[PDB]
């Protein structure tokens, strides 16, 4: 009974919607307090369990509902975010592509703004200080595991439940700081590292991070000092911020906490920092189908 209760029975599964690293995600109607809802649900370790039914609300991490026994496997029931995952919602915005006429029209690349992309970040940020806060290491941290949900408000998606001050996970190349490369351990600090990844994809509408380059070469590459190049399209002030979270001494990158002061400070200026308006030669960065 630590976790709101669910009757099997009170589960109207529909049709799947995704898939995280541990199961499909299935949409489905449920019963909750008498009361008819959407929701996701996973197939989910006793102590996880409780930590995760513990966590407690916060807007930017996706809430769950309830869990459910069945066959001898534990059903989890998520709070819905009806737009998906940020990753595909990045690249259903390229209206450059998916409707040409409408962006030459409107002389735009995206059908969102600076100033939604900031929001993003920043509720990314939010959501990872509150976990941080918590003792929570994510692990994985990247635009398919942050949701779009009601409102376009973005929420914290398939967060390692394993608490500490960094954990050990024997065991997503392009995400992973260079520590977790060489030592397959994760603290929040390797977390900051992805956020700046996960921040630059927001920033390209959804470019696959270091496209044309091979996983092997960044492992030789990124500890002699490379890093992603600045998108054309993004201002300064965004490109240092991700180059603060890359940076190979792990304590020398900013906590969630600076790094949502930053884009406040971003979000408040009249400035725009995302250029998202339709320059004579302009593209989109690249998505390598080849490494997805
Ligand atoms: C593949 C990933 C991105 N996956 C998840 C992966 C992991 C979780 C867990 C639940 C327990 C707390 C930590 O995190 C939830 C979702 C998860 C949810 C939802 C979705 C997806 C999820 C992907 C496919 C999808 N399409 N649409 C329209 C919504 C979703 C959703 O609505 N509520 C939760």
Redesign the pocket.
């Known amino acids: 009974t630590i976790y709101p209760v669910l009757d099997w029975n009170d589960i109207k599964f529909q049709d799947v919607?995704?898939?995280?690293n541990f199961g499909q995600?299935l949409?489905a109607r449920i019963k909750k307090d008498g009361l008819r809802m959407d929701?996701?649900i996973?197939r989910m370790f006793a102590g996880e369990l409780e930590v995760?039914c513990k966590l407690g609300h916060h807007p930017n991490i996706?809430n769950?509902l309830g869990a459910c026994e069945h066959r001898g496997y534990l059903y989890?029931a998520?709070?819905?975010?009806?737009?998906?995952?940020l990753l595909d919602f990045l690249r259903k915005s390229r209206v450059l592509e998916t409707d040409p006429a409408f962006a030459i029209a409107n002389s735009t690349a995206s059908t969102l703004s600076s100033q939604q992309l900031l929001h993003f970040a920043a509720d990314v940020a939010r959501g990872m200080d509150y976990l941080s806060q918590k003792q929570f290491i994510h692990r994985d941290l990247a635009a398919?595991?942050i949701?779009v949900?009601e409102n376009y408000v973005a929420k914290i998606?398939?967060?390692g439940l394993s608490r500490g001050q960094e954990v050990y996970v024997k065991k997503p190349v392009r995400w992973m700081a260079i520590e977790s490369l060489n030592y397959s351990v994760y603290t929040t600090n390797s977390d900051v590292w992805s956020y700046g990844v996960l921040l630059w994809e927001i920033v390209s509408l959804g470019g696959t991070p270091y496209c044309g380059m091979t996983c092997a070469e960044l492992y030789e590459k990124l500890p002699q000092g490379y890093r992603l190049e600045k998108p054309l399209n993004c201002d300064d002030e965004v490109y240092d911020l991700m180059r603060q979270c890359w940076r190979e001494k792990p304590y020398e990158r900013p906590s969630f906490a600076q790094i949502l002061v930053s884009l406040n400070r971003m979000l408040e200026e009249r400035k725009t920092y995302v250029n998202t308006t339709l320059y004579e030669k302009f593209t989109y960065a690249g998505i390598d189908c080849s490494a997805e």
């Open positions: 919607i995704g898939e995280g995600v949409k929701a996701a996973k995760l996706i769950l989890l998520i709070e819905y975010a009806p737009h998906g995952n398919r595991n949701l949900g998606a398939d967060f």
